[PDB]
Amino acid sequence: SQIRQNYSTEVEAAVNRLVNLYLRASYTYLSLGFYFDRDDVALEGVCHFFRQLAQQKRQGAERLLKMQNQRGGRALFQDLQKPSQDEWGTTPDAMKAAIVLEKSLNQALLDLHALGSAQADPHLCDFLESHFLDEEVKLIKKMGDHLTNIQRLVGSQAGLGEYLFERLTL
Amino acid sequence: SQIRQNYSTEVEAAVNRLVNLYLRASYTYLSLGFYFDRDDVALEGVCHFFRQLAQQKRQGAERLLKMQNQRGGRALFQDLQKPSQDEWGTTPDAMKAAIVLEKSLNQALLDLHALGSAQADPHLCDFLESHFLDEEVKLIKKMGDHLTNIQRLVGSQAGLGEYLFERLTL
Amino acid sequence: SQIRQNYSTEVEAAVNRLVNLYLRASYTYLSLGFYFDRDDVALEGVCHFFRQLAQQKRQGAERLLKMQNQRGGRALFQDLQKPSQDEWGTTPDAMKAAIVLEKSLNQALLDLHALGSAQADPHLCDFLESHFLDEEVKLIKKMGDHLTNIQRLVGSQAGLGEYLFERLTL
Amino acid sequence: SQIRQNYSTEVEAAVNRLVNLYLRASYTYLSLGFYFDRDDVALEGVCHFFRQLAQQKRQGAERLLKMQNQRGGRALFQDLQKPSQDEWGTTPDAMKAAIVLEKSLNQALLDLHALGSAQADPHLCDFLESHFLDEEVKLIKKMGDHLTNIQRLVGSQAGLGEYLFERLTL
């Protein structure tokens, strides 16, 4: 490449992997969203919450891909594994699955940051800090807040609590 | 002092003490606010309620300090004791602690008013009546209204009631 | 905690300590401000300068506290030691004390950054760089500029210089 | 009187006396103002400062007179003694004379308040607190601030300091 400079093959490959994880996350959120749109589930605020996340995760993948090209790396795509479930249970079940997913994305971001540090690639390290690390911490905090509220509600009386959380928080 | 007139050393000292009480109240409200911002507590309206009170109490301290200087007294600061708890329980627990705190501030205001009356210091007496005494009565009434509503709710079904009060009142 | 990830107990404790330092700084600036509001000191621009800093330092403490909760740490508050003086001398005396205070805050920021680096916590490191480190460097530069100007003035003729600096710079 | 109620002859007389003191104060400020308008004094900001005070003191007398009639008392006017000086010296001399005058007005307000308290006349007591006592404390603080600044300046180099204070404060 005529532009590549200080960009390791290790980081290049890791970035491609991270693109796959983001796209798979988007796919998972797509499935979550449409499950809550089912006539026999019918929680519109929950559907909207996960559809917005599907967009955000796709957007993150696209930002990674733009950066790959800015650095002179080469995007390589792999298959996208289907989401881990076909049906997602209740709101708390779904929100727990979402936090699990985000923690995994965050760990991948942290791993990539560590790799960039090891490879003395400050551009990468700054890119992740500026566009990804704080967004993850903010989102996971929001999810934990939501889980706490849902749990306080669905302890009391489950269907009622699920409805109220969807109406009054989401 | 070239300006001091009809301002007793007794009042001057009492005002400094009252500044400390207001600042400590602000500090307590800061702690209350951030506790309700915890991911495992997550009651945003409660957090906002106490953060607003932290501001109000700091503002009261500043007004007292401005008055001290207007009268030719000298501000003296003491250490600020940490708040009485590190964790604040449920919404009713917190609101009860807040009413306890405000009653103590109100009694200090009443004590200072009595001192000003005894010292024949009408400026002080007017200052407290105009900026502090009615604000306290209004705030304590609001807190009592809140406590009554919370209690009516958390009798019924506790988690549900706590959520509803936060969503629909705060 | 359901959200905590890559957040060391060491950093958590250090953040709580740093909150205390910021709050104590705010308190010091409050005292500085009101001293310059005394009828026998009466330098309104100096009063305004330190009152603005009191706000800024309180704001920094609040940002730290928000971050503590975003990461799943637990805010713990300690007593706030009273400021180191009850009277603050002349403008240069005050500005020197302020630079001393800010250097100490900056060193605490630098220490915490080093700890985050050691603990491989890039979110923390980015947070400090983005919200605190440059703000400190900018403020300390401003203070050094001020000290240089004050010193050039109060060499010449002290009272006159103090008045002019307050009128024409602050 | 068909309206008079709870209004003592003692207060009525004291109010008339206080009107005289306010009018005499206004007269003094008129003289101060025009002295600083002399071509051989020529401090326009000082002239403006005292002319504004002359207006304020006349306004206070008029408010007292309105209140006298609201209560069913009878305004009685006495001669207005000429001001205590024909020439007022330097800015600090003038400002000291002004503080002396205001302290005397404030003491008269305090005396009248005490009389109203003794006579169980809350309307009077409220009237003075609301329209006069805080205005005096604010004005005397402003004068003390001014005196402190003037003194810091005219120590250094007198004519220069007098000019600068007039240009940059007034």
Side-chain angles (χ1 to χ4, degrees), chain B residues 1-3 27 34 37-40 58 62 66 69 74 77-82, chain C residues 1-3 27 34 37-40 58 66 69 74 77-82:
Chain B
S1 170
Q2 75 201 331
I3 65 175
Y27 202 12
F34 281 99
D37 185 58
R38 288 172 45 165
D39 77 273
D40 63 353
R58 171 186 58 74
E62 289 165 346
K66 176 178 169 184
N69 272 348
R74 292 294 172 252
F77 292 99
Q78 301 298 333
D79 302 339
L80 296 190
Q81 290 299 316
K82 65 172 190 191
Chain C
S1 170
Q2 75 201 331
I3 65 175
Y27 202 12
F34 281 99
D37 185 58
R38 288 172 45 165
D39 77 273
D40 63 353
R58 171 186 58 74
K66 176 178 169 184
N69 272 348
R74 292 294 172 252
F77 292 99
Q78 301 298 333
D79 302 339
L80 296 190
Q81 290 299 316
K82 65 172 190 191

mmCIF file of all heavy atoms in Angstrom, chain B residues 1-3 27 34 37-40 58 62 66 69 74 77-82, chain C residues 1-3 27 34 37-40 58 66 69 74 77-82:
data_model
loop_
_atom_site.group_PDB
_atom_site.id
_atom_site.type_symbol
_atom_site.label_atom_id
_atom_site.label_comp_id
_atom_site.label_asym_id
_atom_site.label_seq_id
_atom_site.Cartn_x
_atom_site.Cartn_y
_atom_site.Cartn_z
ATOM 1 N N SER B 1 -14.030 47.193 61.739
ATOM 2 C CA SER B 1 -14.638 47.371 60.361
ATOM 3 C C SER B 1 -15.204 48.756 60.212
ATOM 4 O O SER B 1 -15.922 49.243 61.120
ATOM 5 C CB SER B 1 -15.768 46.338 60.060
ATOM 6 O OG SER B 1 -16.523 46.596 58.865
ATOM 7 N N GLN B 2 -14.988 49.329 59.031
ATOM 8 C CA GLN B 2 -15.517 50.658 58.702
ATOM 9 C C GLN B 2 -17.035 50.670 58.415
ATOM 10 O O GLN B 2 -17.613 51.733 58.356
ATOM 11 C CB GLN B 2 -14.776 51.252 57.483
ATOM 12 C CG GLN B 2 -15.138 50.668 56.187
ATOM 13 C CD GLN B 2 -14.106 50.871 55.086
ATOM 14 O OE1 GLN B 2 -13.349 51.867 55.075
ATOM 15 N NE2 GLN B 2 -14.069 49.925 54.153
ATOM 16 N N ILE B 3 -17.662 49.511 58.198
ATOM 17 C CA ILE B 3 -19.087 49.471 57.893
ATOM 18 C C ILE B 3 -19.966 48.831 58.989
ATOM 19 O O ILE B 3 -21.195 49.049 58.999
ATOM 20 C CB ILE B 3 -19.405 48.734 56.548
ATOM 21 C CG1 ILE B 3 -19.049 47.252 56.621
ATOM 22 C CG2 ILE B 3 -18.659 49.396 55.418
ATOM 23 C CD1 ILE B 3 -19.483 46.487 55.342
ATOM 24 N N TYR B 27 -23.678 18.823 50.789
ATOM 25 C CA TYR B 27 -22.832 17.632 50.679
ATOM 26 C C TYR B 27 -23.656 16.354 50.824
ATOM 27 O O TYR B 27 -23.511 15.410 50.057
ATOM 28 C CB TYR B 27 -21.754 17.701 51.757
ATOM 29 C CG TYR B 27 -20.523 16.863 51.492
ATOM 30 C CD1 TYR B 27 -20.234 16.269 50.251
ATOM 31 C CD2 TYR B 27 -19.620 16.653 52.512
ATOM 32 C CE1 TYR B 27 -19.028 15.517 50.063
ATOM 33 C CE2 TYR B 27 -18.443 15.905 52.322
ATOM 34 C CZ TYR B 27 -18.142 15.363 51.101
ATOM 35 O OH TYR B 27 -16.963 14.643 50.909
ATOM 36 N N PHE B 34 -26.074 11.040 43.996
ATOM 37 C CA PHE B 34 -25.253 10.028 43.322
ATOM 38 C C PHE B 34 -25.578 8.582 43.689
ATOM 39 O O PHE B 34 -25.419 7.694 42.869
ATOM 40 C CB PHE B 34 -23.769 10.367 43.401
ATOM 41 C CG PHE B 34 -23.391 11.389 42.420
ATOM 42 C CD1 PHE B 34 -23.248 12.734 42.764
ATOM 43 C CD2 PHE B 34 -23.271 11.044 41.096
ATOM 44 C CE1 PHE B 34 -22.941 13.679 41.792
ATOM 45 C CE2 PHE B 34 -22.951 11.980 40.156
ATOM 46 C CZ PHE B 34 -22.783 13.266 40.487
ATOM 47 N N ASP B 37 -28.220 7.518 41.386
ATOM 48 C CA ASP B 37 -27.620 7.331 40.061
ATOM 49 C C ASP B 37 -26.880 5.977 39.888
ATOM 50 O O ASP B 37 -26.430 5.643 38.777
ATOM 51 C CB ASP B 37 -26.639 8.472 39.818
ATOM 52 C CG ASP B 37 -26.045 8.471 38.438
ATOM 53 O OD1 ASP B 37 -26.860 8.536 37.497
ATOM 54 O OD2 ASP B 37 -24.783 8.467 38.325
ATOM 55 N N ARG B 38 -26.703 5.232 40.979
ATOM 56 C CA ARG B 38 -26.090 3.893 40.905
ATOM 57 C C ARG B 38 -26.855 2.983 39.970
ATOM 58 O O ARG B 38 -28.098 3.015 39.936
ATOM 59 C CB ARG B 38 -25.997 3.236 42.254
ATOM 60 C CG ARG B 38 -24.932 3.836 43.185
ATOM 61 C CD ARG B 38 -24.954 3.324 44.626
ATOM 62 N NE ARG B 38 -25.091 1.865 44.780
ATOM 63 C CZ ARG B 38 -24.853 1.177 45.921
ATOM 64 N NH1 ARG B 38 -24.283 1.739 46.993
ATOM 65 N NH2 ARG B 38 -25.058 -0.129 45.964
ATOM 66 N N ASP B 39 -26.122 2.162 39.216
ATOM 67 C CA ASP B 39 -26.822 1.230 38.312
ATOM 68 C C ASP B 39 -27.748 0.216 39.020
ATOM 69 O O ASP B 39 -28.730 -0.277 38.420
ATOM 70 C CB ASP B 39 -25.849 0.484 37.372
ATOM 71 C CG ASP B 39 -25.114 -0.617 38.058
ATOM 72 O OD1 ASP B 39 -24.047 -0.322 38.656
ATOM 73 O OD2 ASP B 39 -25.612 -1.770 38.018
ATOM 74 N N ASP B 40 -27.473 -0.049 40.291
ATOM 75 C CA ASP B 40 -28.235 -0.993 41.099
ATOM 76 C C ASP B 40 -29.321 -0.288 41.962
ATOM 77 O O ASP B 40 -29.947 -0.928 42.855
ATOM 78 C CB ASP B 40 -27.329 -1.935 41.933
ATOM 79 C CG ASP B 40 -26.480 -1.203 42.957
ATOM 80 O OD1 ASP B 40 -26.466 0.035 42.954
ATOM 81 O OD2 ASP B 40 -25.822 -1.870 43.790
ATOM 82 N N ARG B 58 -26.313 24.926 48.635
ATOM 83 C CA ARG B 58 -25.040 25.629 48.391
ATOM 84 C C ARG B 58 -25.339 27.088 48.172
ATOM 85 O O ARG B 58 -24.627 27.960 48.679
ATOM 86 C CB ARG B 58 -24.307 25.026 47.186
ATOM 87 C CG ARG B 58 -23.112 25.828 46.769
ATOM 88 C CD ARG B 58 -22.467 25.309 45.492
ATOM 89 N NE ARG B 58 -23.383 25.285 44.338
ATOM 90 C CZ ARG B 58 -23.799 26.346 43.638
ATOM 91 N NH1 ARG B 58 -23.452 27.595 43.960
ATOM 92 N NH2 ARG B 58 -24.586 26.164 42.585
ATOM 93 N N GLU B 62 -24.083 30.522 50.168
ATOM 94 C CA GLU B 62 -23.471 31.651 49.498
ATOM 95 C C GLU B 62 -24.199 32.979 49.834
ATOM 96 O O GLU B 62 -23.573 34.026 49.952
ATOM 97 C CB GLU B 62 -23.430 31.386 48.007
ATOM 98 C CG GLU B 62 -22.400 30.310 47.686
ATOM 99 C CD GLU B 62 -22.510 29.722 46.296
ATOM 100 O OE1 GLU B 62 -23.564 29.948 45.616
ATOM 101 O OE2 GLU B 62 -21.585 28.909 45.983
ATOM 102 N N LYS B 66 -22.566 36.236 51.610
ATOM 103 C CA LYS B 66 -22.698 37.579 51.054
ATOM 104 C C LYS B 66 -23.202 38.511 52.124
ATOM 105 O O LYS B 66 -22.662 39.636 52.292
ATOM 106 C CB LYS B 66 -23.607 37.553 49.850
ATOM 107 C CG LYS B 66 -23.866 38.899 49.283
ATOM 108 C CD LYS B 66 -24.739 38.806 48.075
ATOM 109 C CE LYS B 66 -25.243 40.149 47.617
ATOM 110 N NZ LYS B 66 -26.207 39.955 46.444
ATOM 111 N N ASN B 69 -20.579 39.463 54.754
ATOM 112 C CA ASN B 69 -19.713 40.531 54.301
ATOM 113 C C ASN B 69 -20.454 41.880 54.215
ATOM 114 O O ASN B 69 -19.860 42.932 54.509
ATOM 115 C CB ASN B 69 -19.108 40.172 52.940
ATOM 116 C CG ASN B 69 -17.824 39.383 53.041
ATOM 117 O OD1 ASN B 69 -17.221 39.257 54.119
ATOM 118 N ND2 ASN B 69 -17.405 38.814 51.905
ATOM 119 N N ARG B 74 -16.958 38.522 59.423
ATOM 120 C CA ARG B 74 -15.900 37.789 58.745
ATOM 121 C C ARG B 74 -16.220 36.335 58.658
ATOM 122 O O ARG B 74 -16.437 35.668 59.670
ATOM 123 C CB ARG B 74 -14.572 38.044 59.420
ATOM 124 C CG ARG B 74 -14.147 39.518 59.205
ATOM 125 C CD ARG B 74 -13.823 39.931 57.732
ATOM 126 N NE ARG B 74 -13.615 41.383 57.590
ATOM 127 C CZ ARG B 74 -14.476 42.222 57.005
ATOM 128 N NH1 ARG B 74 -15.659 41.819 56.482
ATOM 129 N NH2 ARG B 74 -14.127 43.496 56.911
ATOM 130 N N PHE B 77 -14.540 29.435 58.006
ATOM 131 C CA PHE B 77 -14.963 28.139 57.488
ATOM 132 C C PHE B 77 -14.412 27.056 58.367
ATOM 133 O O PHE B 77 -13.286 27.178 58.829
ATOM 134 C CB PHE B 77 -14.474 27.952 56.046
ATOM 135 C CG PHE B 77 -15.131 28.869 55.090
ATOM 136 C CD1 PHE B 77 -14.498 30.034 54.683
ATOM 137 C CD2 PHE B 77 -16.450 28.624 54.675
ATOM 138 C CE1 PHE B 77 -15.145 30.932 53.863
ATOM 139 C CE2 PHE B 77 -17.096 29.500 53.818
ATOM 140 C CZ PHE B 77 -16.413 30.654 53.402
ATOM 141 N N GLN B 78 -15.193 26.000 58.550
ATOM 142 C CA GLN B 78 -14.704 24.831 59.270
ATOM 143 C C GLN B 78 -14.790 23.621 58.396
ATOM 144 O O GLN B 78 -15.396 23.608 57.344
ATOM 145 C CB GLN B 78 -15.497 24.592 60.560
ATOM 146 C CG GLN B 78 -15.435 25.769 61.528
ATOM 147 C CD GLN B 78 -14.026 26.098 62.050
ATOM 148 O OE1 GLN B 78 -13.119 25.233 62.136
ATOM 149 N NE2 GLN B 78 -13.826 27.400 62.390
ATOM 150 N N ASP B 79 -14.216 22.537 58.877
ATOM 151 C CA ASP B 79 -14.338 21.316 58.115
ATOM 152 C C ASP B 79 -15.801 20.971 57.873
ATOM 153 O O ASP B 79 -16.691 21.234 58.696
ATOM 154 C CB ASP B 79 -13.747 20.085 58.784
ATOM 155 C CG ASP B 79 -12.268 20.192 59.129
ATOM 156 O OD1 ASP B 79 -11.482 20.942 58.645
ATOM 157 O OD2 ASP B 79 -11.926 19.453 59.989
ATOM 158 N N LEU B 80 -16.044 20.310 56.734
ATOM 159 C CA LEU B 80 -17.342 19.725 56.401
ATOM 160 C C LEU B 80 -17.374 18.248 56.680
ATOM 161 O O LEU B 80 -16.703 17.461 56.009
ATOM 162 C CB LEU B 80 -17.783 19.965 54.928
ATOM 163 C CG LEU B 80 -18.047 21.335 54.403
ATOM 164 C CD1 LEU B 80 -18.694 21.110 53.008
ATOM 165 C CD2 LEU B 80 -18.999 22.167 55.274
ATOM 166 N N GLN B 81 -18.160 17.878 57.667
ATOM 167 C CA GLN B 81 -18.296 16.496 58.022
ATOM 168 C C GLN B 81 -18.977 15.788 56.874
ATOM 169 O O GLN B 81 -19.940 16.282 56.311
ATOM 170 C CB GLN B 81 -19.085 16.302 59.305
ATOM 171 C CG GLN B 81 -18.260 16.793 60.479
ATOM 172 C CD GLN B 81 -16.953 16.032 60.635
ATOM 173 O OE1 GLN B 81 -16.966 14.796 60.531
ATOM 174 N NE2 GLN B 81 -15.811 16.765 60.827
ATOM 175 N N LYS B 82 -18.481 14.610 56.602
ATOM 176 C CA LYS B 82 -19.097 13.748 55.598
ATOM 177 C C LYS B 82 -20.546 13.427 55.972
ATOM 178 O O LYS B 82 -20.929 13.418 57.153
ATOM 179 C CB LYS B 82 -18.350 12.435 55.425
ATOM 180 C CG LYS B 82 -18.318 11.521 56.562
ATOM 181 C CD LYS B 82 -17.687 10.209 56.089
ATOM 182 C CE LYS B 82 -17.803 9.094 57.073
ATOM 183 N NZ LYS B 82 -16.928 7.988 56.611
ATOM 184 N N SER C 1 -21.250 -5.928 40.979
ATOM 185 C CA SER C 1 -21.976 -5.009 40.014
ATOM 186 C C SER C 1 -22.235 -5.714 38.713
ATOM 187 O O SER C 1 -21.318 -6.366 38.156
ATOM 188 C CB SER C 1 -21.185 -3.696 39.719
ATOM 189 O OG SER C 1 -21.719 -2.896 38.652
ATOM 190 N N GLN C 2 -23.431 -5.483 38.175
ATOM 191 C CA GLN C 2 -23.825 -6.052 36.882
ATOM 192 C C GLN C 2 -23.161 -5.362 35.669
ATOM 193 O O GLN C 2 -23.237 -5.888 34.580
ATOM 194 C CB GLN C 2 -25.360 -5.994 36.707
ATOM 195 C CG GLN C 2 -25.904 -4.664 36.411
ATOM 196 C CD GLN C 2 -27.385 -4.498 36.723
ATOM 197 O OE1 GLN C 2 -28.177 -5.466 36.675
ATOM 198 N NE2 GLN C 2 -27.768 -3.268 37.050
ATOM 199 N N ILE C 3 -22.558 -4.184 35.846
ATOM 200 C CA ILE C 3 -21.942 -3.478 34.728
ATOM 201 C C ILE C 3 -20.403 -3.381 34.792
ATOM 202 O O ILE C 3 -19.759 -3.119 33.756
ATOM 203 C CB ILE C 3 -22.496 -2.024 34.542
ATOM 204 C CG1 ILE C 3 -22.136 -1.130 35.726
ATOM 205 C CG2 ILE C 3 -23.991 -2.071 34.357
ATOM 206 C CD1 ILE C 3 -22.564 0.343 35.492
ATOM 207 N N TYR C 27 -13.934 24.360 47.833
ATOM 208 C CA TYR C 27 -14.094 24.988 49.147
ATOM 209 C C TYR C 27 -13.068 26.100 49.358
ATOM 210 O O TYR C 27 -13.391 27.190 49.810
ATOM 211 C CB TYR C 27 -13.948 23.912 50.220
ATOM 212 C CG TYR C 27 -14.568 24.247 51.558
ATOM 213 C CD1 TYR C 27 -15.446 25.325 51.764
ATOM 214 C CD2 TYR C 27 -14.266 23.467 52.653
ATOM 215 C CE1 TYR C 27 -16.024 25.561 53.055
ATOM 216 C CE2 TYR C 27 -14.831 23.711 53.919
ATOM 217 C CZ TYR C 27 -15.718 24.736 54.110
ATOM 218 O OH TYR C 27 -16.295 24.961 55.360
ATOM 219 N N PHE C 34 -14.869 34.882 48.778
ATOM 220 C CA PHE C 34 -15.492 35.731 49.799
ATOM 221 C C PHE C 34 -14.533 36.657 50.544
ATOM 222 O O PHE C 34 -14.924 37.734 50.957
ATOM 223 C CB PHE C 34 -16.411 34.928 50.711
ATOM 224 C CG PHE C 34 -17.708 34.661 50.079
ATOM 225 C CD1 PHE C 34 -18.001 33.440 49.471
ATOM 226 C CD2 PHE C 34 -18.634 35.670 49.986
ATOM 227 C CE1 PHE C 34 -19.223 33.247 48.837
ATOM 228 C CE2 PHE C 34 -19.837 35.459 49.376
ATOM 229 C CZ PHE C 34 -20.135 34.280 48.817
ATOM 230 N N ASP C 37 -14.334 39.728 48.559
ATOM 231 C CA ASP C 37 -15.594 40.459 48.724
ATOM 232 C C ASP C 37 -15.683 41.277 50.039
ATOM 233 O O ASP C 37 -16.649 42.035 50.246
ATOM 234 C CB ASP C 37 -16.736 39.450 48.683
ATOM 235 C CG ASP C 37 -18.099 40.082 48.714
ATOM 236 O OD1 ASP C 37 -18.343 40.888 47.794
ATOM 237 O OD2 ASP C 37 -18.913 39.718 49.613
ATOM 238 N N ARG C 38 -14.724 41.087 50.945
ATOM 239 C CA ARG C 38 -14.671 41.880 52.188
ATOM 240 C C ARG C 38 -14.603 43.362 51.899
ATOM 241 O O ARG C 38 -13.918 43.790 50.952
ATOM 242 C CB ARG C 38 -13.502 41.499 53.054
ATOM 243 C CG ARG C 38 -13.640 40.137 53.751
ATOM 244 C CD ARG C 38 -12.387 39.637 54.472
ATOM 245 N NE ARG C 38 -11.690 40.635 55.301
ATOM 246 C CZ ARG C 38 -10.748 40.354 56.231
ATOM 247 N NH1 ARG C 38 -10.482 39.104 56.628
ATOM 248 N NH2 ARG C 38 -10.146 41.333 56.885
ATOM 249 N N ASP C 39 -15.300 44.154 52.715
ATOM 250 C CA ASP C 39 -15.240 45.612 52.496
ATOM 251 C C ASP C 39 -13.830 46.228 52.638
ATOM 252 O O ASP C 39 -13.533 47.285 52.035
ATOM 253 C CB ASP C 39 -16.240 46.380 53.388
ATOM 254 C CG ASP C 39 -15.779 46.498 54.802
ATOM 255 O OD1 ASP C 39 -16.058 45.555 55.587
ATOM 256 O OD2 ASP C 39 -15.121 47.520 55.122
ATOM 257 N N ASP C 40 -12.960 45.552 53.377
ATOM 258 C CA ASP C 40 -11.596 46.001 53.627
ATOM 259 C C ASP C 40 -10.573 45.348 52.653
ATOM 260 O O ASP C 40 -9.331 45.481 52.843
ATOM 261 C CB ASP C 40 -11.181 45.857 55.113
ATOM 262 C CG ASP C 40 -11.170 44.418 55.598
ATOM 263 O OD1 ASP C 40 -11.608 43.528 54.856
ATOM 264 O OD2 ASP C 40 -10.706 44.162 56.734
ATOM 265 N N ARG C 58 -16.105 22.208 41.549
ATOM 266 C CA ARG C 58 -17.266 21.413 41.990
ATOM 267 C C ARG C 58 -17.758 20.605 40.819
ATOM 268 O O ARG C 58 -18.098 19.426 40.965
ATOM 269 C CB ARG C 58 -18.372 22.323 42.540
ATOM 270 C CG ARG C 58 -19.649 21.589 42.812
ATOM 271 C CD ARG C 58 -20.786 22.512 43.225
ATOM 272 N NE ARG C 58 -21.098 23.546 42.223
ATOM 273 C CZ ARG C 58 -21.739 23.354 41.064
ATOM 274 N NH1 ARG C 58 -22.135 22.145 40.658
ATOM 275 N NH2 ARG C 58 -21.998 24.396 40.283
ATOM 276 N N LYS C 66 -19.989 11.012 38.332
ATOM 277 C CA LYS C 66 -20.786 10.433 37.256
ATOM 278 C C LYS C 66 -20.027 9.291 36.635
ATOM 279 O O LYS C 66 -20.605 8.197 36.401
ATOM 280 C CB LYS C 66 -21.139 11.496 36.244
ATOM 281 C CG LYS C 66 -21.872 10.966 35.069
ATOM 282 C CD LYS C 66 -22.225 12.066 34.124
ATOM 283 C CE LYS C 66 -22.735 11.557 32.802
ATOM 284 N NZ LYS C 66 -22.974 12.740 31.861
ATOM 285 N N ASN C 69 -19.936 6.107 38.771
ATOM 286 C CA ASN C 69 -21.142 5.318 38.627
ATOM 287 C C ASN C 69 -21.242 4.660 37.237
ATOM 288 O O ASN C 69 -21.732 3.523 37.124
ATOM 289 C CB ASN C 69 -22.373 6.192 38.889
ATOM 290 C CG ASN C 69 -22.769 6.252 40.345
ATOM 291 O OD1 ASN C 69 -22.281 5.480 41.185
ATOM 292 N ND2 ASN C 69 -23.654 7.204 40.664
ATOM 293 N N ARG C 74 -18.265 2.698 43.394
ATOM 294 C CA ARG C 74 -19.126 3.268 44.419
ATOM 295 C C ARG C 74 -18.502 4.472 45.039
ATOM 296 O O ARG C 74 -17.399 4.410 45.582
ATOM 297 C CB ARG C 74 -19.485 2.217 45.443
ATOM 298 C CG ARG C 74 -20.400 1.145 44.800
ATOM 299 C CD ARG C 74 -21.817 1.632 44.352
ATOM 300 N NE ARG C 74 -22.544 0.606 43.583
ATOM 301 C CZ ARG C 74 -22.767 0.658 42.265
ATOM 302 N NH1 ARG C 74 -22.328 1.672 41.482
ATOM 303 N NH2 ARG C 74 -23.478 -0.318 41.722
ATOM 304 N N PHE C 77 -17.573 9.227 50.272
ATOM 305 C CA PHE C 77 -17.262 10.615 50.593
ATOM 306 C C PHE C 77 -16.559 10.667 51.917
ATOM 307 O O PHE C 77 -16.913 9.911 52.810
ATOM 308 C CB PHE C 77 -18.546 11.455 50.640
ATOM 309 C CG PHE C 77 -19.187 11.606 49.317
ATOM 310 C CD1 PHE C 77 -20.256 10.800 48.957
ATOM 311 C CD2 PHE C 77 -18.643 12.488 48.370
ATOM 312 C CE1 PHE C 77 -20.797 10.878 47.693
ATOM 313 C CE2 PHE C 77 -19.204 12.604 47.108
ATOM 314 C CZ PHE C 77 -20.306 11.795 46.788
ATOM 315 N N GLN C 78 -15.607 11.582 52.035
ATOM 316 C CA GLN C 78 -14.955 11.814 53.318
ATOM 317 C C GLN C 78 -15.132 13.240 53.730
ATOM 318 O O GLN C 78 -15.552 14.097 52.980
ATOM 319 C CB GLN C 78 -13.460 11.476 53.260
ATOM 320 C CG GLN C 78 -13.189 10.024 52.877
ATOM 321 C CD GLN C 78 -13.734 8.986 53.871
ATOM 322 O OE1 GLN C 78 -13.898 9.239 55.091
ATOM 323 N NE2 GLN C 78 -14.049 7.779 53.330
ATOM 324 N N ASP C 79 -14.735 13.526 54.954
ATOM 325 C CA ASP C 79 -14.805 14.904 55.378
ATOM 326 C C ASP C 79 -14.016 15.804 54.437
ATOM 327 O O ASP C 79 -12.984 15.423 53.864
ATOM 328 C CB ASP C 79 -14.228 15.176 56.760
ATOM 329 C CG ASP C 79 -14.869 14.379 57.888
ATOM 330 O OD1 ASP C 79 -15.940 13.864 57.870
ATOM 331 O OD2 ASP C 79 -14.176 14.268 58.843
ATOM 332 N N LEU C 80 -14.487 17.052 54.322
ATOM 333 C CA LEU C 80 -13.778 18.121 53.620
ATOM 334 C C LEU C 80 -13.043 19.020 54.576
ATOM 335 O O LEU C 80 -13.656 19.759 55.350
ATOM 336 C CB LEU C 80 -14.692 18.995 52.714
ATOM 337 C CG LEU C 80 -15.400 18.424 51.533
ATOM 338 C CD1 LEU C 80 -15.977 19.654 50.779
ATOM 339 C CD2 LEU C 80 -14.493 17.629 50.583
ATOM 340 N N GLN C 81 -11.732 18.958 54.512
ATOM 341 C CA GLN C 81 -10.913 19.779 55.356
ATOM 342 C C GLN C 81 -11.122 21.218 54.943
ATOM 343 O O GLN C 81 -11.149 21.538 53.766
ATOM 344 C CB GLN C 81 -9.443 19.412 55.270
ATOM 345 C CG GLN C 81 -9.224 18.063 55.928
ATOM 346 C CD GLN C 81 -9.604 18.062 57.400
ATOM 347 O OE1 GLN C 81 -9.246 19.015 58.110
ATOM 348 N NE2 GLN C 81 -10.377 17.026 57.855
ATOM 349 N N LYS C 82 -11.202 22.055 55.943
ATOM 350 C CA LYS C 82 -11.289 23.494 55.714
ATOM 351 C C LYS C 82 -10.062 23.997 54.951
ATOM 352 O O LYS C 82 -8.965 23.419 55.023
ATOM 353 C CB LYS C 82 -11.396 24.281 57.011
ATOM 354 C CG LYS C 82 -10.259 24.234 57.926
ATOM 355 C CD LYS C 82 -10.521 25.243 59.047
ATOM 356 C CE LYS C 82 -9.342 25.484 59.929
ATOM 357 N NZ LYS C 82 -9.809 26.254 61.109
#
